[model samples]
Target: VIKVSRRRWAVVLVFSCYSMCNSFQWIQYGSINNIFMHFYGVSAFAIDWLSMCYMLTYIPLLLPVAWLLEKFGLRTIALTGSALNCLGAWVKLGSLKPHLFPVTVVGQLICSVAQVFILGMPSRIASVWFGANEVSTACSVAVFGNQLGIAIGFLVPPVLVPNIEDRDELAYHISIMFYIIGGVATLLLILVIIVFKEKPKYPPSRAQSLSYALTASYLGSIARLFKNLNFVLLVITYGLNAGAFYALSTLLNRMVIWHYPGEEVNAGRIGLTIVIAGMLGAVISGIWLDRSKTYKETTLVVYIMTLVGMVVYTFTLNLGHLWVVFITAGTMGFFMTGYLPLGFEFAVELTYPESEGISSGLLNISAQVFGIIFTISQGQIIDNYGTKPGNIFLCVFLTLGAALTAFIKADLRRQKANKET
Candidate 1:
């Protein structure tokens, strides 16, 4: 039977908190795009740098980060991520000076780099710390923390920085928001150092022990991953789904502002509702996976739900109706974010003996590539044609992704590894 401990739970909280910090930094700007635009006098494409950079920075760093996880252990990498997050938050705060938007971008880019470290940890943290029965739930909760922070990041800015016409008043509120976010990051960093552990005295599950037994070089493992057809399909499917979410996340404000008009708080509330639904969906998805062990079924079902939400949302966004916006936005957010942890754990299972960190990192790399593509291209599309065309842009990719996911064959690699090791 598998076993677990309170210390392991603490470790979960520590890394989850780090994940939270990273997201808060990435999402805070988009959550209050209006205020940011007014303060910085930047275009939609430029503003997107705040969120898009999170994905852009990950492209080159993920491979090295995966190596960090393999060469080091969980504690060292977790600590490094926490430190970078703290440093990035404070650095952004330093940009409170007028006409220092560039400084803010630099600070945000640092946090983006930090995300490469923390995002990959959800699966690694779950595999190392939780029993098999609880691994999905733990991974879900760990991921939930990051999504929850993104939800709050979406919620807080509108409340903190209102839609004010006056320049000085807007700047005042924005500065205060930065201070509060920085302080929170500092506190989380301390907690991570204090609570995060390397590992327990014993392995919690057979998979965890097997991971310890398997010793493949990082490059060799990555080469093996490329050879696996299921893994390739997974990367494409997840990359498209996740990249669409990233594109929408950075542009949600732009999409609705045309209809809503000066409703920053409303936009934030809409973002909160969608992400709250996602957190709930994530928990439910996790519990279902743990109980049923039907990873393929769950992923496919959620992908369908997510596609429907995206299509319905694109059709309804131009309707100028708040209820329609909330319904459709919440639907997309719930299923898309809900499927996130499943993707991570599924990758780990499909690519076992290759190290969870590397597999998860590669998944994020594909996601980043797509995110950058959509963010840059969609911005120009929306700027030239309108939000309608941009929304359609996302829908097309999600449809293509669903088609790819439909044909991915389940394999015996992980099961065989479990028994042999």
Candidate 2:
């Protein structure tokens, strides 16, 4: 018998908290790029690597991690993710000194590896723990936690560490930020260890129950995913949209500073506004999907809107008004960030009975690959030409993504399975 459990909420809550800690660490370095650049005596590109490391590390480790998840289970992955994230947080403390930048990079690398474990779990967790009716919404909640972490990441670092001329004072401020993040990571690790479970006593839905009985090898499921035309389209389009968001976020401070000199704090606030608005879009999109099962239509509409938002943001970015930038950024984020959960849910639907871990892992890998490419290329574009050209470059990709998204065949296989049962 299929039965959802109240304990599912407990599992997701702790998992979300753990995800928040990791994501917060991801963007923290970039949010206060100027302060970190001065404090560490590094170039802006070096500071960008602090965030890019998350994307770089994710590429090689995702397959192995997905294999491990299939071999082990959710609880094992949860414990590993939280433990590594906590360890990385404390490791950053060793780099409090300016000359010890490599130490912090090592810490960040560890956390990035932990992210590979965490990123694929949202869809897997939702399917395993939630009923058919709420799977999309549950996945959104899990992703929401990560987005909230990023929103806080953008807001907190700039406030905590300002552009102080005193190197010693700067070091002190950086240490305080590290300690706070480390403490939270440690606490969440403990909570995850205590609260997370591999699965409920009963399968939450027929699809999940069917998933448990499937004997496909990890590589086999991955092979099937690649064979699916709709999923392939999803991989490319999702990458384009999400990769643009990543590049935009990594370079947000620079983008704002170029247009409005010395408004570092407002740049961070703009990042916050983008993510906050996206969080709302994500939750709303998730609910809409649950209610309507209109996966293709919703995804196409959001993808088109994301492109439109990008167009608006690109033109409005240099309009000499902070509030205009804020509004444009929010509009872009609402569609771009909202697309995250849609991609995950749509992948799950298309690749039913295949492992969610594998499907989502591939999607994330695509995003990271594109993220690294887009960030480096756009950063160079902005350096030589200007923000407008760089943003227009992303706009081209968004247009391509919307077109590709339009072509994906909406075959809700998992939902079909649930209904048939």
Candidate 3:
């Protein structure tokens, strides 16, 4: 048993320090709606379509960036991601032209690269520095930072952006907000790079090279893992699950407006509350997982919560009163964030300890692949179904993922049964 040393703990602090930079993501979610309404106007369907564009745009970049991380390492990727994130936000604030939408899209696209690094790397750190039972806790703790960012994002804009009717002016106001978030984050990323390194003493082996980890073992690296049923299940389940969650993000406020109609800010607050609940849930589950031994069992328990949460959100929310919205949102947060950290944990669990970094890269690649699907699908739903119904699509996505979770459990069981025989 390799006990984590003081140095190991020092390495883990990088998780907290670099992660403070995640506040930008929260700001994006908080203000993205105001920016959209400003530029595109308040038509329910238009909101869905544009928001969908933002959500889905990250898909194409997933694999390419994963390959880059395999080559460049985390410190480099983090710095690069921060630069892109800053550039994207600044361009996003530029005065509206025929090209304004394109600029925002490109900026977000660049930000997606940074997002992949942030989402993926911390899990690797957690897996390495912590015990096996503690993987979930470590992973969840990192995700809590994400929730904090969302909390801030959800709260900030309505307070900052004056209630203005003009679209161009509203966009400008939101741009100012984006500029602040991006500028600060990029600066932090610059410092993080100077301080962080891939290895402190024992350098990474050639076998540990990004391309090598991604492609080194024809039998073990790519094909063997893909052929393994559990790995496949993990990837597919993670993809669909991620898609469901991303699709839900853009819909929270619209759902409120449909029923309440006048209180967009109130609805956004509900969304914020959901993320806050998720952050709490993430901490709880993370601690629970950190103490537990079996990743499979933990996953099953969390998957059940996700199913219940999705059903509540999809079918039962707003049935009598919008109070159901809060319940559904909170439940959604519980299951959604609970599942998020596991992808990295699962990848690391399945791989060699030495390959923690590569394992994380693989998990992120899967997330990017599926995250794109849900985002794009949400857009199409908006284009065709209008806002409220399009929002329903995410709930369906949750159910779809729940079904996949069951399959993952069965896949594990079958493999175990075969080995016993």
- lDDT against the true structure, per candidate, is 0.82, 0.89, 0.59
C-alpha TM-score for every candidate: 0.91, 0.95, 0.77
Give residue 245's lDDT in candidate 2 (0 to 100).
88
Clash pairs, model 1 backbone: none
Candidate order by lDDT, decreasing, is 2, 1, 3
lDDT of 3 by residue, 1-421 (tens): 1243345454444445445445445345435554555554444444344334433444555446655665666556656755665665565666354235655556555555556556666775564345434545767777777566667766676665666777557666766776766676666656656655554343222222221333353235555566666667677677666656765765566556766777775787787777878788878777765565456776766776776777666666556467788888888777777777765566555554324545565555566566666666766776687754665676566566566666664332212321342
Q: Give one digit per residue, the lDDT tens place, for model 2 in 278-302.
A: 8998898889999999998999999
Candidate 1 lDDT by residue in tens digits, 47-108: 76787777778898888888888888888888888888988888987776558889988898
lDDT for model 2, on a 0 to 1 scale?
Answer: 0.89
Clash pairs, model 2 backbone: none
| Candidate 3 backbone overlaps, count | 4
Lowest summed lDDT across 10 adjacent residues in model 2 is found at 211-220
Off by over 4 Å in 3: 1-32, 35-57, 90-103, 128-135, 165-176, 202-220, 351-400, 407-421
State the displacement of the C-alpha of residue 110, model 1, in Å, after optimal TM-score superposition: 2.0
